[PDB]
Design a protein around this ligand. Structure first.
Ligand SMILES: C[C@@](O)(CBr)CCOP(=O)(O)OP(=O)(O)O
Ligand SMILES: C[C@@](O)(CBr)CCOP(=O)(O)OP(=O)(O)O
Ligand SMILES: [Mg+2]
Ligand SMILES: [Mg+2]
Ligand SMILES: [Mn+2]
Ligand SMILES: [Mn+2]
Lengths: 176, 180
């Protein structure tokens, strides 16, 4: 696997091996973030495994990852849902298409990403990949937003920025 | 470094080295938990380091620990505050002396404790110990309490159980007053 390096505009200019891409000096690259809801409307929140290079052991939205060269955002989402959670989903919908961020985790690892955000519904049970996910919770979106609003620091910084964007929180609030 | 083992009652019967004390089969032993507030009345919340054997990487209250032989619980509080946070405190107040906790962590490690709960003010700057604490925040207690209410799974279960005890919470609230 690789990440896709992006110039100032989001134009692909090359790739980096995924392991080697995330450092204290992470270069801008392409990502996605996705929020998954079951048929009942509950939101899946996941806790990143202790072996993830960036934000290990951090509670976050459902599935995030890195599209490969020539791969659609939506296929990337569908792929990582299968890989991390062993779950089938409905076609991903856009909730925050121009999301972009740069942050630093507690050990100094940086994420630096153009990261369009998607939502989708699960259509099968979860089969957890414990190399990716160490814990998860099915919850009510409203409680998760209250959590993010009251103690944002208990969640990943991108989950927080995403949940607090006017339009994105509005669009997320429909899948319930 | 050890833990003081307690029998069915709550009376000391001996000691056990700390690491080997906490496993899938942890015996009952003495612990403490403390909630620290700055002059401003903000609450110090901390994130356990990823190398902690139990609940690594988890957000929790200020400091927890294990008193040693011949140590009072209060001196244990003072000592771990220094060790984990580098911080001096005011005399710790007993806010929940009968708290006891048994729980299994995400990888199967068990805590099984008699855990009197304290509160104090910090009287020095922090010098965080990265071997113990990987992140922290100064927060308004109110905010903290709302997060624990909304998403309690995002926090250590003992932090939630202590914050939801009525008497303990009244005490925490008392420490939010601004005091020069
Ligand atoms: C914005 C983002 O951190 C969500 C994108 C990155 O996701 P991951 O860190 O989970 O990436 P992968 O390791 O490829 O799964
Ligand atoms: C007080 C408590 O619930 C936290 C018990 C566990 O404390 P620790 O795990 O932090 O113990 P130490 O490693 O001795 O610091
Ligand atoms: Mg991922
Ligand atoms: Mg401790
Ligand atoms: Mn990345
Ligand atoms: Mn213990």
């Amino acid at each position: 696997e690789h990440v896709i390096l992006l110039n100032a505009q989001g134009v692909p200019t090359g790739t980096l091996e995924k392991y080697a891409a995330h450092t204290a000096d992470t270069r801008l690259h392409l990502a996605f973030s996705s929020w998954l809801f079951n048929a009942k409307g509950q939101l899946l929140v996941t806790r990143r495994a202790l072996s993830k290079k960036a934000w290990p052991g951090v509670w976050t939205n459902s599935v995030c990852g890195h599209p490969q060269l020539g791969e659609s955002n939506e296929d990337a989402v569908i792929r990582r849902c299968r890989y991390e959670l062993g779950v089938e989903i409905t076609p991903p919908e856009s909730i925050y298409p121009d999301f972009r961020f740069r942050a630093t985790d507690p050990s100094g690892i940086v994420e630096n990403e153009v990261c369009p955000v998607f939502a989708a519904r699960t259509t099968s049970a979860l089969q957890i990949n414990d190399d990716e996910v160490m814990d998860y919770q099915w919850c009510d979106l409203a409680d998760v937003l209250h959590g993010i609003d009251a103690t944002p620091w208990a969640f990943s910084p991108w989950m927080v920025m995403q949940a607090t964007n006017r339009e994105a929180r509005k669009r997320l609030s429909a899948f319930t």
